[PDB]
Design a protein around this motif. Sequence first.
Motif, mmCIF file in Angstrom:
data_model
loop_
_atom_site.group_PDB
_atom_site.id
_atom_site.type_symbol
_atom_site.label_atom_id
_atom_site.label_comp_id
_atom_site.label_asym_id
_atom_site.label_seq_id
_atom_site.Cartn_x
_atom_site.Cartn_y
_atom_site.Cartn_z
ATOM 1 N N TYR A 98 0.864 -1.183 0.000
ATOM 2 C CA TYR A 98 0.000 0.000 0.000
ATOM 3 C C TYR A 98 0.902 1.235 0.000
ATOM 4 C CZ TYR A 98 -3.754 3.264 1.034
ATOM 5 O OH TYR A 98 -4.699 4.265 0.970
ATOM 6 N N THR A 99 1.433 1.566 -1.170
ATOM 7 C CA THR A 99 2.354 2.683 -1.337
ATOM 8 C C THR A 99 1.738 4.078 -1.364
ATOM 9 O OG1 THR A 99 2.292 2.530 -3.761
ATOM 10 C CG2 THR A 99 3.936 1.193 -2.600
ATOM 11 N N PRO A 100 2.587 5.116 -1.281
ATOM 12 C CA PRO A 100 2.161 6.518 -1.299
ATOM 13 C C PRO A 100 1.325 6.899 -2.518
ATOM 14 C CG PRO A 100 4.299 6.411 -0.337
ATOM 15 C CD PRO A 100 4.015 5.020 -0.904
ATOM 16 N N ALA A 101 1.702 6.395 -3.690
ATOM 17 C CA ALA A 101 0.962 6.684 -4.921
ATOM 18 C C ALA A 101 -0.415 6.027 -4.864
ATOM 19 C CB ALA A 101 1.730 6.185 -6.142
ATOM 20 N N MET A 102 -0.492 4.863 -4.223
ATOM 21 C CA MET A 102 -1.773 4.166 -4.090
ATOM 22 C C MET A 102 -2.602 4.967 -3.089
ATOM 23 S SD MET A 102 -0.412 0.163 -3.690
ATOM 24 C CE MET A 102 0.801 -0.519 -4.802
ATOM 25 N N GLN A 103 -1.963 5.404 -2.003
ATOM 26 C CA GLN A 103 -2.649 6.168 -0.961
ATOM 27 C C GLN A 103 -3.194 7.492 -1.474
ATOM 28 O OE1 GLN A 103 0.919 4.495 1.962
ATOM 29 N NE2 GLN A 103 0.224 6.614 2.198
ATOM 30 N N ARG A 104 -2.497 8.107 -2.423
ATOM 31 C CA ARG A 104 -2.950 9.391 -2.953
ATOM 32 C C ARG A 104 -4.144 9.248 -3.886
ATOM 33 N NH1 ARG A 104 1.005 10.351 -5.757
ATOM 34 N NH2 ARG A 104 2.960 9.709 -4.710
ATOM 35 N N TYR A 105 -4.180 8.142 -4.621
ATOM 36 C CA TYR A 105 -5.270 7.887 -5.549
ATOM 37 C C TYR A 105 -6.531 7.626 -4.715
ATOM 38 C CZ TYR A 105 -7.295 6.079 -9.967
ATOM 39 O OH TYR A 105 -8.054 5.802 -11.079
#
Length: 214
Positions: A98-105
């Motif tokens: 659950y990465t930062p880019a996933m978290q931002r989306y």
Amino acid sequence: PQDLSEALKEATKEVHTQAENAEFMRNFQKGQVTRDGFKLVMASLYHIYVALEEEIERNKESPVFAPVYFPEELHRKAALEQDLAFWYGPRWQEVIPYTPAMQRYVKRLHEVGRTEPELLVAHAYTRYLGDLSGGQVLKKIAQKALDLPSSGEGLAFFTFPNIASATKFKQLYRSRMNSLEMTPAVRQRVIEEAKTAFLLNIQLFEELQELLTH
């Protein structure tokens, strides 16, 4: 053109080409794709869709979204759960990234669902009509470049069993989209939001590329 369905298609023509040009995605279209990279996109899809389908449930009755509410024909969480069980084992939920880019989306998705409902169709459009078309493309590519086992699972995401004809459903979905009542200001923001959805996918791919390489 004048119909939202066509205005959206034309306004995102540009960002879509950028999506295709994303190195990670570019390398994918050329066959070169690792099992670990495919796992990362399946994980990405899981979080994105959990978030999106949650917000759609919250606004299922809102006049700004009801027309494009097709729970049975489109839900994807279940399919993704089945695939993730295959790609990550029975304890997938405790091991998927659950990465930062996933978290931002996911963050934007919730912002839209809770404070900017009128724009949710933009994300629904981007994802569903996009995956309905693109799916059969990536499925094939992966299918071979991965050499997965005859376990008969792991790619359920790419098949919408409750849709007999992708072409008919799209026609119907665009029709519902075009029946949405929205002011010029709202319509412009919907179009911009579709652009934003693309950008979120582009930077997600960028992040997945720097990860795969270390």
